[PDB]
Amino acid sequence: XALF
Amino acid sequence: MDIILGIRVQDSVILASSKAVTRGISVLKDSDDKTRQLSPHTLMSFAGEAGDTVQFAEYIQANIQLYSIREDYELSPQAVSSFVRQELAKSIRSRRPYQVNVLIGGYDKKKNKPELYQIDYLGTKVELPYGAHGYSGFYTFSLLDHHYRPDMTTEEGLDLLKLCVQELEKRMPMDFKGVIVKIVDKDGIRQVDDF
Amino acid sequence: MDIILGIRVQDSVILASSKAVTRGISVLKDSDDKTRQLSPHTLMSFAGEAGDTVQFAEYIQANIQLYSIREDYELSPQAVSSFVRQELAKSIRSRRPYQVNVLIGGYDKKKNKPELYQIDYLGTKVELPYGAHGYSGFYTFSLLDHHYRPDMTTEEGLDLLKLCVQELEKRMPMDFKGVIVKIVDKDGIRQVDDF
Amino acid sequence: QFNPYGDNGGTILGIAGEDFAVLAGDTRNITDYSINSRYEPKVFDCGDNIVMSANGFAADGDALVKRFKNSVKWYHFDHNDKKLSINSAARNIQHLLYGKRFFPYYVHTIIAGLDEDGKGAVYSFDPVGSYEREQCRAGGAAASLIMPFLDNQVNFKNQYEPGTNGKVKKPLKYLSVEEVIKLVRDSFTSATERHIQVGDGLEILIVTKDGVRKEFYELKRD
Amino acid sequence: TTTLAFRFQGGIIVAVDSRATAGNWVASQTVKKVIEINPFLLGTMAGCAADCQFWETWLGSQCRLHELREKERISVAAASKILSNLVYQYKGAGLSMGTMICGYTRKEGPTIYYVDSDGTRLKGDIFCVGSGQTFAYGVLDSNYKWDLSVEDALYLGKRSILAAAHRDAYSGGSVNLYHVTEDGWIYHGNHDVGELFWKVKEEEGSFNNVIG
Amino acid sequence: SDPSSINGGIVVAMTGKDCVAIACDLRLGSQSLGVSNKFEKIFHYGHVFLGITGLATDVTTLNEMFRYKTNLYKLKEERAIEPETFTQLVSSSLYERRFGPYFVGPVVAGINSKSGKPFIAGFDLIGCIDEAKDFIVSGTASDQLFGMCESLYEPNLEPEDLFETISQALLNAADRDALSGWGAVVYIIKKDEVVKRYLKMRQD
Amino acid sequence: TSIMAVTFKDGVILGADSRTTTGAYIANRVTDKLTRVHDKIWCCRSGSAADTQAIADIVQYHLELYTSQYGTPSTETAASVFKELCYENKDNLTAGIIVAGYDDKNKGEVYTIPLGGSVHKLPYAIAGSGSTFIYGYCDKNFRENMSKEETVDFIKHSLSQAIKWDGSSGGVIRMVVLTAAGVERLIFYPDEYEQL
Amino acid sequence: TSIMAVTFKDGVILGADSRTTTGAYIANRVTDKLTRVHDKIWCCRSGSAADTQAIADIVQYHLELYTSQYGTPSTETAASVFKELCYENKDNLTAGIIVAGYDDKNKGEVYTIPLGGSVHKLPYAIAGSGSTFIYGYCDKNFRENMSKEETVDFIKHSLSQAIKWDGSSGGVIRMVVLTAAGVERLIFYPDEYEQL
Amino acid sequence: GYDRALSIFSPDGHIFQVEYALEAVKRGTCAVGVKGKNCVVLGCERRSTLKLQDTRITPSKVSKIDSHVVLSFSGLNADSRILIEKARVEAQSHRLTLEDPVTVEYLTRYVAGVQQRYTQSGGVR
Amino acid sequence: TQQPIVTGTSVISMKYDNGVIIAADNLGSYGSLLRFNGVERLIPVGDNTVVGISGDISDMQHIERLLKDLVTENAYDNPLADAEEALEPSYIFEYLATVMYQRRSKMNPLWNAIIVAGVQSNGDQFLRYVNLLGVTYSSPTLATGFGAHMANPLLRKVVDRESDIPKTTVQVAEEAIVNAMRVLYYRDARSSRNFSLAIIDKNTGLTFKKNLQVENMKWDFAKDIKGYGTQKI
Amino acid sequence: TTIVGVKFNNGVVIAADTRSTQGPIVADKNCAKLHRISPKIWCAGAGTAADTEAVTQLIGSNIELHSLYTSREPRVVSALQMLKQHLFKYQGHIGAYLIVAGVDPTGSHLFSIHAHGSTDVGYYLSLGSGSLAAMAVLESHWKQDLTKEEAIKLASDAIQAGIWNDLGSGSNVDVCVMEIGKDAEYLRNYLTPNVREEKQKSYKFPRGTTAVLKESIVNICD
Ligand SMILES: [Cl-]
Ligand SMILES: [Mg+2]
Ligand SMILES: [Mg+2]
Ligand SMILES: [Mg+2]
Ligand SMILES: [Mg+2]
């Protein structure tokens, strides 16, 4: 997993 | 959510509930009130999975309050505890169960008696002279077995409760940041501000 | 085993180490000294897996003491830290590695300088102005980045250390039962009894 | 067990100028160690001066572009042929992407065009719909190779004015369409050298107020 | 990510970093993590980028619908609960959000609510949220007093993000500052860590661990 | 639990006109936590330079090991080891641990004192030699470094120009990697003088 | 199981062993794997006994209802109904079915339907665990337009070998002859076929 | 693989296909699976190519050393050495080996050694993935004391069918004839055997 | 389900079912509301053709919706219970989501919305 | 979620100056067993399109039925069904491409790789690929399975880019296809000697060739190969 | 990697590409995959790069000692036997896939060895990720009685097929020709069909662009  | 205790004495029920709210390696809050007033003479403390606890407590509160308005009448602690148990008993076989353990402390105005009920997330109800949820019981139950008497006053109950909190603060691994203590009696619900 | 800190100031190294020893849901002890004196001017604190910590610390202590007798000479903190790192570096590729993290605080008598070394269980050595192992660092490093100065006195270092312990006692989940503080300087090693 | 995703490789690049914007992308399409096509375009004119590319899993990429193109069409029907602004398109695409939050389009989407003040605009999306306007963005397989080069050459990062003791930064300025295309071509030739999934051909779509122009360049085919 | 917001004598300070990461890949250094719901309400974003960005802009639409229907600005409590009740419906689905709803209303005064994706909703004076929250806590707590000035409070919030930006690998880029008063929120600029660190190091004399 | 990306770090080496450059960042961390901003990854044995990225304990262990071996080499051979020879020694030593390897990405750099030829080389963790005319990259931001070096590099750069190219390659690569940065060092190596420069970079 | 169906001059013959196993135990040593879905359309069942039975029962129902409205169904029609069930429920079925039937126009026809739910029209078909051992033998010995007696010998010798090598196959060899004359059941016992 | 060995009047013949596969790719289409361990003691290799080669090399070494001390070894002796290796290392080997040899006293002999490391002396033996398809055919067609030409036809027809049905088998059919006369190699190409 | 449009327009532009519902209200016992400077008072008529009543248990004319809001009515008694129940549920639901009790205007707006919904829904009067 | 049972191997194809060629063997494998030998995997749609299908045969037969039904549906209320409003290759492909992607999106794919070869009404060559994932691409040469690894390299030596298409005749193109089929027979373990080949030309139309065989095979050198290393005999 | 081996009239030729990969990244654009075991015995290697180099050198070393001990030129079968027994002992954990070729007093030879220790004989062989592309060419154009110049052409064409069609292979073509009675000729970079085109721009920075904190002279002398 994802973009944090 | 971790420590919730309950002690029924002669003329009142005393609920003690830890103030710490911990997420990961951070204590996010140290003044959390893990309880809701279901009716003027009925108080419920709670502990368990994050989110579920408050969502469940408030859902119960709303239902009991709705009943109070409809009938212009306060449900007995026994009636409220049975309602709460059934909700948890439904919940455990749901798609996603409420992982919430509760103590219900109430004063029955018709019987003129205090009543303490311990209900776990499975819907397992028991009336007790003193109760606890989680790891707290493993210390407090044996302590109360020894020091508890059924004819104790509210002041004696508070000293007995101090003895439990001290033992927990000594031997528990986690810092639970003390407790909020509330008393339920014939005159309703009130909070002890200095504990 | 959980909290070990280290602060190198102008003329000394200060090591603070938690007193709690917890196993399961019970704090078995609240006065544990998580350190060994390797030589008159060299002190090592430690934290990690149960049993391994003390077994490793004492094994190092014996080896350094053996060296002191053989040569009638005290090894420098840099020399001791390198010896300790190599032992851990061997250990990590053993059948069962020592899961121990250490801080080595020493005063080099030839250089007349305090020295703090942080070594993890993999054998990763670094010299630092201030160090920590475990979750402690996540609070103390940022705090020390702000408040630390290189020319501080021992008394200023102790106040800086109090500021760390307070922050840990506020935001850490577990109760670590305070710390034992020890100072390493030109006059050797001594313990602060009131912290 | 059936795996519904695949990696079709390739890489894309969007740069925004003062009164223009470019969206480039290599034309190579691959699976594993095999080349499927040496010329398979993945940068598309979607109308209303919006160019779009959804790089990664080509099936999800094509599906997304197809749905956005259709979204533009219905925006005209429902709102009296109003021109879809680049900012409105970006928000619309977020909802498309997030609509499948629990079974995502495995693509890095980039759109380019002009904002409502006539200035160059590039928007970039993650697979689940988080978006941001930027001057500069590389996406896809060779993004990690190209992006830091863009930081250095487009946004002048880590570059200080000579003789100022590293105190004065190199001033930001808009690049010309000529200078931008040079950076695009050098970015793709470099990516082709050091990345196996990048090569064959480079297709650039340039967007000005006049319309959408195309340019094509050969890339190494090994 | 690193976000904080604290309550004090002069209202609320809100401070966030601007880094976005995909594993160890630094994806962006210029992300807006504060959402402007309305002139009196702010929301901070940590966790999944899309989840935060999507649901907090949605929250803003729900707050707008409230004031149309009720002819009155939504309370900070009501606004936070709309968000907390939403994420609770998705509990177990894998949403990843650590948010803070900050604002001022007449009946409540300055108020901060921590809301996260596992359904936790907490009112409080100080919160730090994100991978670098502990680093921000360390500096913030050790220097926090209720009687801070608006100038000192703004700096402490900025300095706390800088501390986290430095130590936490997954935080950085730049600091975004906000101040919330009785009159509404006020933006106090974007501060690049690239220049801010050396400026702070020199003027404050801190960060002695770093090679000057 | 990936040994090559716990501590983080990068090394890059380039060749120029009658010179070589080798550069590295200063970060040493434990995953997200930055721990040290003084951890240098470049060492030297006589005129031969060795950069090592990867697991920090092994970086230290190998430095100590190659110091050990080059010292004995010098005593017996009565001369300093050369880059081509040292490269083979590194390869041998790494492959000796084939089925229990040091988790490292070493990079040799130096000028042969006899021929005067600039030399650089890279290795994988089990000793496979990667010789190169242009540049060698290593570490957690290798992808970024490959991209920067491939675009920025040109042959026969003068020492002063080469410095700018290698520095800009390292800095911009480090800024796109979470586990790299926190300071940087660049060595410019000429036939009989070596200049070491610490770079100013963003500290996040 | 060992099953087969063979077209010949006068029509078609279906053949099968009689063994049903639960692991290495023989639950039934006199099983009838040749089953009637219509007057002159029969099928050989292999795979799961529960699945093949359930399928055959449904097909029989469909062809009975077909006959009430549209008259006698073709052998192709029967195979299509089998396929439809096997193909659409391929994730929950373990059924290898050979369909064999006699029309007056089309004469003898054989369709095989493997696990996937595909259909294959053939001159002859073999299936079941014991079929693997007789691919070589059947391919070398099969001829088109055989007589009734030749086809009976072909099936008997083939299944005899399948039974001999396959532990999952055995018992008696049942056969069903489909021609214009009618329907004839045949049985052959171990003492005869074992010593072929 | 498809391999076999057949004893006959004058001695014994070994037969094999020439296909080696890595999954569904044919790594080698002209493999020699018939390998000499002694002058007139040969073996057919099936299973892991690495294991069978390593084994055959060791056996060849043992029989060479045997010959230097005790003279020509029997075919039984060779099979015993194969067995010893296969049995004692059964946990690390995937080897199905057929041993075939010619003595002057014992004439032609065939021993088969399956995965387990057991030994079985037979008139003829078949092995490898493609053998499953020709158990029926080989059992029906094999006769003892065949001529050289009959045995060659038997092996050719058999392996032809194995190859036809088994995807893991194919290429050319190699054969090795072991008699008092000497050692003769034979080869047969697709164009001949496919249309048998 | 029963779908019939019972409430519909007539040639003169009237919805007779809604107007006939007003006639039912006109038949109902009188109810009065007067608000003072710091209070509101709800008066209610009770018809005296009913003697032998039990006033303890007989449903009161004025009903509490929440602890701070009351509802009296005129018209069909059975119909009033449905509105009161819905109102009481909405009052608790508002406290649960808004963390604040309903305003009197909001509660009225809800009850009025329910009444309106029954004037253009199929199958209901 | 599926697993393929009876499978068909490579389908190979290429463009030439006036049209397209497509070929595929007549085998229906059952794992390592070469079960069925009379399987037609090239299915013509009208007189201007040929769909070549590899992978699961049961799903192939389903797709046949869809295409068969598509021709019927197109003819309904369509006076120009055999003229201007006849089915184009591009229509047939896009339909299949839609179905393939919808099926993968429902986690229940048609386990196939498909190549739609044909000639459009305006004389343009059509050649496009689609598979179980809904992935689509076009190229001067297209091939599935082992064909992708072994045929494409050979076919690309004839038509390496777009500009080589007008230079390539039907004789040269067919020769390359037939040569590729031989190489696949040498090296693909799940292939057969028998195959079908189809040519769709803009002038001569659809030519469908059945029962072709791989021939002119080199096997003679095998006799000289002895042992696996040392062995001389 | 693409490697091939082809037998001809009076000897044998082997060839290889020159790409070394690190996942999808091209690490070395011109590595040498042809290895000398002895003067007239050469080895093309695919698989784990370190293992191919390490195993070829070890056997090469032992072959040299064996040659000195026996006062004889080394044979290809000796290298083959030594390699396979080593590889087999390690059960495929040494990921070396080799094509061994050479001339010796016995004649000219061509073998392949796989990581688990199995060996094959042939007139034409191909190993590596681009072996199927190479083998397709070899199967199409190989014949009996090839000349020296025909075998080099065939071998390099097989490598080229890998270079263009396999993503794992690329850059240049190395060749080694081993003819009987002659010295083996190693043809490093026999073909170079993948030369990098001129860059659009020079990225030589103005001197002083990089900000510096410290300078110091390093002591390399004693
Ligand atoms: Cl069966
Ligand atoms: Mg209980
Ligand atoms: Mg290539
Ligand atoms: Mg950072
Ligand atoms: Mg049997």
What's the CATH code of the domain at F187? 3.60.20.10
Closest CA to D198 of D25, D2, D16: D25
Whole-number Å distance between alpha carbons of K120 and K128: 15
Closest D-chain CA to J108: D2
The C-alpha angle H79, H82, H87, rounded to 5 degrees, equals 115
Note down the domain range covering H187.
1-196
Contact between residue F165 and residue K213 where contact means Cβ atoms under 8 Å apart: no
Find the length of chain A.
4
Which of left, alpha, beta for H73 (phi over 0: left; psi -120 to 50: alpha)?
beta
Optimal mutation site among J152, J182, J185, interface K, most CBs of chain K within 10 A: J152
Closest CA to E189 of E179, E199, E180: E179
- Please give the tally of structural domains in chain D: 1
Tell me which chain A residues have a C-beta less than 8 angstroms from the C-beta of D130.
3
Amino acid found at E112: I
**CA B140 / ligand 2 centre spacing (Å):** 15
Half-sphere exposure at residue G91, Cβ-oriented, CA atoms within 13 angstroms:
7
Q: Does H147 touch chain J (CB under 8 A)?
A: no
Secondary element (H or E) of residue H49: helix H49-70
Where are the domains positioned within chain E? 1-212
Touch of K by A (3+ CB pairs closer than 8 Å) = no
Question: Which residue intervals of F44-202 are DSSP H helices?
Answer: 56-77, 83-96, 142-152, 159-174
Contact between residue G45 and residue G37 where contact means Cβ atoms under 8 Å apart: no
**J125: how many CB neighbours lie within 10 A of its CB?**
21
Amino acid found at K44: A
* Proximal ligand: closest to the CA of E1: 4
Whole-number Å distance between alpha carbons of D97 and D125: 9
- The sign of the torsion formed by the CA atoms of K182, K184, K188, K192 equals positive
Amino acid found at D157: K
Burial class (CB in 10 A: 0-12, 13-18, 19+), D82: exposed
CB within 5 A of ion ligand 5: which residues? G 163, 170
Note down the domain range covering K142.
1-222
Q: Which residues contact G151 (CB under 8 A, 6 or more apart)?
A: G6, G8, G13
Q: Which residues contact G182 (CB under 8 A, 6 or more apart)?
A: none
Buried residues in F28-41 as b, exposed as e (16+ CB within 10 A): bbbbbbbbbbebbb
Angle of the H75-88 helix axis to the H49-70 helix axis, nearest 10: 130
Q: Token pair 């002992």 is at which residue? A: K89
- Please give the tally of structural domains in chain J: 1
Whole-number Å distance between alpha carbons of K121 and K76: 12
Contact B52 E124 (CB under 8 A): no
**CA H100 / ligand 5 centre spacing (Å):** 29
Residues pairing with C181 in the sheet: C16, C192
Secondary element (H or E) of residue H162: helix H148-165
* 3-state secondary structure (DSSP) of residue B78: helix
Note down the domain range covering F127.
1-204
**CA G163 / ligand 5 centre spacing (Å):** 4
Find the length of chain B.
195
Contact between residue K136 and residue J183 where contact means Cβ atoms under 8 Å apart: yes
Phi first, then psi: give them for residue D140, nearest 5 degrees: 105, -160
Touch of E by A (3+ CB pairs closer than 8 Å) = yes
Question: Would you list the DSSP string of K150-217?
Answer: HHHHHHHHHHHHHHHHBTT--S-EEEEEEETTS--EEEEEEE---PPPPPSS--PPPTT-S-EEEEEE
C1-195 homologous superfamily: Aminohydrolase, N-terminal nucleophile (Ntn) domain (3.60.20.10)
Q: Which residues contact G194 (CB under 8 A, 6 or more apart)?
A: G160, G164
- Please give the tally of structural domains in chain F: 1
The subunits that touch chain I, with at least 3 C-beta pairs less than 8 Å apart, are B, E
What's the gap in Å between the CA of H57 and the closest CA on chain K? 10
Domain E1-212 has CATH 3.40.190.10: no
Whole-number Å distance between alpha carbons of D36 and J148: 8
Contact between residue K193 and residue K174 where contact means Cβ atoms under 8 Å apart: no
Phi first, then psi: give them for residue K149, nearest 5 degrees: -70, -30
CATH of the domain at G106: 3.60.20.10
Sheet holding C4-8, edge to edge: C130-133, C4-8, C12-18, C179-185, C188-192
Tell me which chain B residues have a C-beta less than 8 angstroms from the C-beta of E130.
none
CATH of the domain at K155: 3.60.20.10
Whole-number Å distance between alpha carbons of G150 and G158: 12
Secondary element (H or E) of residue H154: helix H148-165
- Please give the tally of structural domains in chain K: 1
**CA K169 / ligand 3 centre spacing (Å):** 5
Closest CA to F179 of F42, F2, F9: F9
Whole-number Å distance between alpha carbons of G178 and G156: 16
Q: List the structure tokens of C40.
A: 């008159």
Note down the domain range covering J22.
1-233
Phi first, then psi: give them for residue I5, nearest 5 degrees: -80, 95
Q: Token pair 């070398």 is at which residue? A: G140
Find the length of chain D.
222
**CA K19 / ligand 3 centre spacing (Å):** 10
CATH of the domain at D5: 3.60.20.10
Q: List the structure tokens of H168.
A: 């893991």
The technique is X-ray
**J142: how many CB neighbours lie within 10 A of its CB?**
29
Q: Does G139 touch chain J (CB under 8 A)?
A: no
Question: Would you list the DSSP string of chain D?
Answer: ----------EEEEEE-SS-EEEEEE--EEETTEEEES-----EE-STTEEEEEEESHHHHHHHHHHHHHHHHHHHHHTTT----HHHHHHHHHHHHHHTTTS---EEEEEEEE-TTS-EEEEEE-TTS-EEEESEEEEETTHHHHHHHHHHHTS-TT-B-TTSTT-SBPPP-PPPHHHHHHHHHHHHHHHHHHBTT--SEEEEEEEETTEEEEEEEE----
- The bridge status of strand H3-7 relative to strand J19-25 is unpaired
Whole-number Å distance between alpha carbons of D60 and D109: 11
**CA G7 / ligand 5 centre spacing (Å):** 26
**Distant-in-sequence contacts of H30-34, Cβ < 8 A, 24+ apart:** H30/H171, H30/H172, H30/J219, H30/J221, H30/J222, H30/J225, H30/K122, H31/H171, H31/J228, H31/K120, H32/H174, H32/J225, H32/J226, H32/J227, H32/J228, H32/J231, H32/K121, H33/H1, H33/H3, H33/H174, H34/H174, H34/H175, H34/H176
Q: Does F87 touch chain K (CB under 8 A)?
A: no
The subunits that touch chain B, with at least 3 C-beta pairs less than 8 Å apart, are C, E, I
Contact between residue C12 and residue C114 where contact means Cβ atoms under 8 Å apart: yes
Contact E96 A2 (CB under 8 A): yes
Q: Does G136 touch chain J (CB under 8 A)?
A: no
Residue D86's alpha-carbon distances to D47, D112, D117, D122, G145, in angstroms, are 11, 8, 11, 9, 75
Q: Does H10 touch chain J (CB under 8 A)?
A: no
Q: Which residues contact E140 (CB under 8 A, 6 or more apart)?
A: E4, E6, E126, E128, E156, E157, E160
Closest K-chain CA to E198: K213
Residue H20's alpha-carbon distances to H50, H166, H168, J184, K156, in angstroms, are 12, 12, 7, 15, 26
Q: Which residues contact G39 (CB under 8 A, 6 or more apart)?
A: G72, G183
Contact between residue H8 and residue H154 where contact means Cβ atoms under 8 Å apart: no
Residue E1 falls in the annotated catalytic set: yes
Closest CA to H184 of H170, H174, H171: H174
SS (H, E, C) chain J: CCCCCEEECCEEEEECCCEEEEEEECCEEECCEEEECCCCCEEEECCCEEEEEEEEHHHHHHHHHHHHHHHHHHHCCCCCCCCCCCCCHHHHHHHHHHHHHHHHHCCCCCCEEEEEEEECCCCCEEEEEEECCCCEEECCEEECCHHHHHHHHHHHCCCCCHHHCCCCCHHHHHHHHHHHHHHHHHHECCCCCEEEEEEEECCCEEEEEEEEECCCCCCHHHHHCCCCCCCCC
Q: Which residues contact C52 (CB under 8 A, 6 or more apart)?
A: C98, C99, C100
Residue K125's alpha-carbon distances to D188, J154, K158, in angstroms, are 36, 17, 10
Catalytic residue among H1, H35, H112, H151: H1
Closest CA to B6 of B187, B195, B178, B179: B179
Closest CA to K168 of K136, K138, K132, K137: K132
Contact J230 K123 (CB under 8 A): no
Where are the domains positioned within chain B? 1-195
Task: Give the number of B-C residue pairs with CB atoms closer than 8 Å.
Answer: 38
Whole-number Å distance between alpha carbons of G175 and G44: 10
Contact between residue K148 and residue K8 where contact means Cβ atoms under 8 Å apart: yes
Contact between residue H128 and residue H2 where contact means Cβ atoms under 8 Å apart: yes
Tell me which chain K residues have a C-beta less than 8 angstroms from the C-beta of H92.
91
Q: Which of G132, G136, G162 faces H161 most closely, judged by CB atoms? A: G136
Q: Token pair 């880059």 is at which residue? A: F83
Whole-number Å distance between alpha carbons of J98 and J106: 12
Of all residues in chain H, what percent are helix, strand and coil, respectively (each to 5)? 35, 35, 30
Amino acid found at K119: T
Residues pairing with J14 in the sheet: J21, J141
Contact H53 K114 (CB under 8 A): no
The reply to whether E50 sits in an annotated binding site is no
Closest CA to H167 of H24, H45, H30, H33: H24
Closest F-chain CA to K200: F151
Residues pairing with J199 in the sheet: J21, J207
Contact between residue B98 and residue B52 where contact means Cβ atoms under 8 Å apart: yes
Contact I95 B62 (CB under 8 A): yes
Note down the domain range covering D222.
1-222
Whole-number Å distance between alpha carbons of G3 and G126: 6
Q: Please, which residues 155-194 of chain F have a Cβ atom closer than 8 Å to chain D?
A: 168, 171-173, 175-176
CATH of the domain at J110: 3.60.20.10
Which of left, alpha, beta for J221 (phi over 0: left; psi -120 to 50: alpha)?
alpha
Whole-number Å distance between alpha carbons of I41 and I2: 41
Closest CA to J195 of J29, J34, J41, J15: J41
Contact E119 B50 (CB under 8 A): yes
